[PDB]
Design a protein around this ligand. Structure first.
Ligand code: 2CP
Length: 261
């Protein structure tokens, strides 16, 4: 069909979704996220084998992440259940087709977890990636955090999150995050060919395995108590002062000062 924030394209049985939010740098706004969900929903058809997420060629930034302004004021949980990021990720995961991420430019925060949540990840030799909840003082959620612990080692993810610094593709590759890393000029082709090949295969097989794999990576559980406990700390980081100072600094585009409360 036709979407406002997105741009779908079919090549054989390969669908390619292109982000069209250049004005907000492809920040994760509900509006955007919603369209992305409509476009996927739409593409859930027998004729479609493999999907592909991408940012317009030339892009300097894949996605800047969550839209701060859209962040909570400090009344509820930002990272709620029905929060845009939660939905698309759950969605992407339970999606019966393979979803490749062709990355161009930089990825930030929520983007990283989003593309992390996909099945494959091909990237330009130049992209960079960085997890940044700490730069603003955000107490992510458990699930969000989990989805980042399925490829790279703990120490690595810890380093990622902790310093909130950006890593290069080459590194992100070496640590087992991305599948491949190509030269810009070759990025599209490469990704395409792969999607075509994968689409030569038994769609029904793929759907089940991807579901088994999903069912497995979630096989991490804990008691009632333990959840509320972390949830409590979560709440407490919200109502924090360092918190507020976190947004501000940014909005005021000034370097923040964390106190410890
Ligand atoms: C954990 C995480 C935290 S929430 C957010 C995580 N996002 C980040 O950590 C990325 C922060 N954004 C940036 O580092 C940068 O904007 C970056 C690298 C994308 C571009 O640097 P740049 O020099 O090319 O551009 P810039 O700094 O001039 O920013 C240009 C414009 O984009 C806006 N802008 C950038 N990122 C965001 C965002 N996430 N939400 C809302 N507005 C944003 C700036 O406020 C600004 O608007 P005006 O100039 O009109 O005022 C998450 O839930 O995702």
């Amino acid at each position: 069909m036709s979407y406002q924030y997105v741009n779908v394209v079919t090549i054989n049985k390969v669908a390619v979704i292109e982000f069209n939010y250049g004005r907000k740098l492809n920040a994760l706004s509900k509006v955007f996220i919603d369209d992305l969900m409509q476009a996927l929903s739409d593409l859930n058809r027998p004729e479609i084998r493999c999907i592909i997420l991408r940012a317009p060629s030339g892009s300097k930034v894949f996605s800047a992440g969550h839209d701060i302004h859209e962040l909570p004021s400090g009344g509820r949980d930002p990272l709620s259940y029905d929060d845009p990021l939660r939905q698309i990720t759950r969605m992407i995961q339970k999606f019966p087709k393979p979803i490749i991420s062709m990355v161009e430019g930089s990825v930030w925060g929520g983007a990283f977890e989003m593309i992390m949540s996909s099945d494959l990840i091909i990237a330009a030799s130049t992209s960079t990636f960085s997890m940044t909840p700490v730069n603003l003082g955000v107490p992510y959620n458990l699930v969000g955090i989990h989805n980042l612990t399925r490829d790279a080692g703990f120490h690595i993810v810890k380093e990622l999150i902790f310093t909130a610094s950006p890593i290069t593709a080459q590194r992100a590759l070496a640590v087992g995050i991305l599948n491949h890393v190509v030269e810009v000029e070759e990025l599209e082709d490469f990704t395409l060919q792969m999607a075509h090949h994968i689409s030569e295969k038994a769609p029904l097989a793929i759907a089940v395995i991807k579901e088994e794999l999903r069912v497995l990576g979630e096989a991490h559980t804990m008691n009632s108590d333990e959840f509320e406990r972390i949830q409590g700390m979560r709440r407490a980081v919200y109502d924090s002062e360092d918190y507020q100072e976190g947004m501000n600094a940014f909005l005021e585009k000034r370097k923040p000062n964390f106190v410890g409360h």
